[PDB]
Design a protein around this ligand. Structure first.
Ligand SMILES: [Cl-]
Ligand SMILES: [Mg+2]
Length: 667
DNA sequence: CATTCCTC
DNA sequence: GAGGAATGCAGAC
DNA sequence: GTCTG
């Protein structure tokens, strides 16, 4: 038998990996249960003809920020060079010789993001990619952005072709497998959207990703599977680049010449046919920012796009660019100028970095990683920042820049990848800008060698304490596996099924005017004459359940019922189509539930007060028993309908697959 | 995490 | 319009 | 009251 561990941000993320495996693997024997109170498992026996295999997947929901688990699995990434504070959605490990070894990192993205949102999470791919551990970025193509007021669809937005290409270039540079894989989203409707007329459906990688995962679990040669996935990532670059105006963006022939190794991104013969022209909003301008931008536009050549936040100053024009920068900011020191004038191409990245109050820009954290993925981390990068800094930030820059990098993820990104950091920033509470020219070359070189303490890691299945993650794991296990077809809902979408169709609402907002998005929505069809939709919220303590949370969960489902579902499909047939017919709330029984951990500190009066405060129809008080390890579940119904649900759960707390022996239902 | 704002 | 620039809320601490 | 999703 081989044992694997799925370390995820939550049980849903862990189960997504199992669903990928199970989509290709048709197992002969499947057994579910818990190895510990926090760790569910799935044990499978499957065969490849005559060859039988026995695997067990132990799931570890919720990553550390020794915070939750006794040791952090993410430490194995920082030991191999992942110096950014980047957490993927899932880490699959193999248990061998009493320790864990990372097989791959997986990140799930609900939509093909566009603009600076496309590279917002590029730090994850850059940092995990330079470790040698594969990084698989799985994105749904496509999901429409909605106007949350009326759920009407906004026009499709696509990332710059350089974003999907950065994964391929990072793969080439690092010798590691870093790829962007596209899964067919329910809203992929090419018959109705003209933007998708030239999309090649061979780019979809559902079968290929499952084949790759299974081959890695089997310790098989993945070279051929990797090449198929890389080719699909390259076809996305072709789809995107052939849909953009060639005048100020790279053509597919240019990307292809870089891909096949004919030229590097900085020695392209056609480099310069468009310049690097950074767009700065008027409201953002201060100090000598506008004149610096003019100096850049005087010597720059465009890198992939004329308006991306970065470009190249070729070594042939570097001396004149440096001379102009020194004349603008009154840099006279001969030692400083000598460092700036090194004979090599210079990549100039210009970022505001900070919002009006001095708070860091989330998308900017992936800007330098994107540059490093495209042109190599060893390339000389000149980072120019012009946004407002709080007095504490400028003080740390002049005292110990690494101390600032340690507290803030954006500063971490800047200090780790810039050879020169130039600030021309307003300081909050001060009348004028502060200028800094930081020769960060030695520091960057040291950071690119920094690795955390080498140590074998075996995450103990029992955490420091049980909290929201554990409540969520228990709620998901009971309602999704123990209690007996419908998908239900979560933060990614709500599905409602009948005898012919499945209706699905995508792009769920966190809140509506009167509602709050439930953690889980459970559909029960064989209890009442109408289907039941049970909306659940999970918290660590009963007092964490906010006032009227139960009423807000129902009002959220009522909000979705006010609109035609995003998509629908015939369960018997297939293929997702756009929503045609509206659903009616009277066709369903809606109930709300609040789940939490309670160690018998709640009296009859306390339960009565929780019901009065939250308005929940059902309260699920969960408590762990240590010897023997068991989850004691106490279901407290508020009314007669919820009591019928409690009886249904108690009667159906039986399973041929799930080991119900780990639970004790008091009532 | 995501939506609106602003420049070419 | 295209699409990068520029925002802020929220939850957890 | 800060950091990050
Ligand atoms: Cl194409
Ligand atoms: Mg992720």
């Amino acid at each position: 038998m081989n044992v694997f561990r799925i370390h995820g941000d939550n049980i849903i993320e862990c189960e997504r990996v199992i669903d990928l495996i199970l989509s290709k693997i048709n197992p002969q024997k499947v057994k579910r249960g818990f190895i510990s109170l926090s760790c569910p498992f799935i044990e499978i026996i499957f065969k490849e003809g005559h060859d039988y295999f026995h695997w067990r997947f132990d799931m570890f929901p919720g990553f550390n920020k020794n915070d939750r688990w006794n040791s952090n699995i993410l430490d194995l990434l920082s030991q191999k060079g992942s110096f950014l504070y980047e957490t993927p959605d899932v880490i699959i490990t193999s248990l061998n010789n009493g320790k864990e070894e990372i097989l791959m990192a997986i990140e799930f993205c609900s939509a093909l993001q566009a603009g600076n949102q496309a590279w917002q999470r590029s730090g994850r791919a850059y940092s995990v990619g330079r470790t040698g551990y594969p990084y698989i970025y799985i994105v749904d193509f496509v999901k429409y952005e909605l106007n949350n007021s009326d759920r009407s669809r906004k026009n499709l937005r696509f990332p710059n072709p350089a974003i999907p290409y950065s994964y391929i270039s990072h793969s080439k540079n690092t010798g590691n497998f870093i790829v962007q894989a596209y899964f067919r989203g329910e809203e992929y409707q090419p018959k109705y959207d003209k933007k998708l007329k030239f999309f090649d459906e061979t780019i979809f990688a559902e079968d290929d990703i499952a084949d790759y995962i299974i081959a890695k679990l089997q310790h098989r040669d993945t070279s051929n599977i990797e090449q198929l996935l890389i080719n699909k990532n390259l076809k996305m670059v072709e789809f995107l680049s052939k849909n953009t105006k060639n005048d100020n963006n790279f053509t597919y022939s240019e990307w292809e010449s870089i891909y096949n190794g004919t030229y590097r991104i900085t020695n392209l013969p056609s480099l310069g046919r468009f310049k690097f022209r950074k767009k700065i909003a008027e409201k953002s301008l201060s100090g000598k920012v506008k004149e610096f931008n003019n100096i850049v536009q005087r010597y720059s050549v465009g890198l992939a796009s004329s308006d991306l936040p970065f470009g190249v100053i070729r070594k042939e024009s570097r001396n004149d660019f440096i001379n102009d920068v020194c004349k603008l900011y009154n840099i006279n020191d001969m030692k400083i100028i000598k460092e700036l004038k090194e004979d090599a191409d210079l990549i100039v990245c210009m970022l505001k970095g900070f919002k009006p109050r001095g708070d860091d820009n989330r998308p900017d954290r992936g800007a330098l990683p994107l540059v490093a993925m495209l042109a190599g981390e060893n390339a000389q990068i000149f980072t120019f920042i012009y946004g407002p800094l709080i007095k504490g930030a400028i003080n740390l820059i002049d005292q110990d820049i690494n101390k600032l990098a340690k507290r803030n993820g954006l500063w971490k990104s800047f200090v780790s990848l810039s050879d020169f950091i130039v600030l021309d920033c307003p300081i909050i509470g001060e009348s004028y800008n502060e200028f800094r020219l930081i020769i960060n070359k030695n520091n960057k070189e040291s950071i690119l060698r920094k690795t955390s303490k080498q140590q074998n890691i075996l995450v103990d299945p029992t955490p420091n304490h049980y909290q929201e993650n554990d409540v969520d794991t228990v709620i998901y296990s009971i309602f999704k596996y123990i209690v007996p077809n419908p998908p239900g809902g979560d933060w990614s979408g709500l599905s409602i099924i009948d005898n012919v169709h499945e209706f699905r609402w995508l792009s769920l907002p966190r809140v509506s005017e009167n509602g709050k998005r439930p953690d889980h929505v459970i559909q029960i069809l064989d209890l009442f004459e109408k289907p039941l939709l049970l909306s659940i919220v999970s918290k660590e303590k009963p007092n964490d359940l906010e006032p009227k949370i139960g009423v807000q969960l129902i009002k959220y489902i009522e909000y979705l019922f006010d609109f035609t579902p995003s998509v629908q499909r015939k369960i018997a047939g297939g293929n997702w189509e756009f929503g045609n017919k509206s659903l009616v709330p009277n066709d369903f029984i809606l109930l709300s539930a609040g789940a939490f951990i309670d160690y018998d500190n709640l009296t009859e009066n306390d339960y009565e007060k929780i019901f009065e405060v939250t308005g929940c129809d059902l309260l699920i008080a969960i408590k762990n028993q240590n010897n023997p390890q068991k989850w004691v579940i106490k279901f407290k119904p508020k009314n007669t309908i919820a009591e019928k649900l409690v009886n249904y759960i108690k009667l159906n707390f039986k399973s041929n697959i799930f080991d119900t022996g780990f639970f004790h239902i008091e009532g």
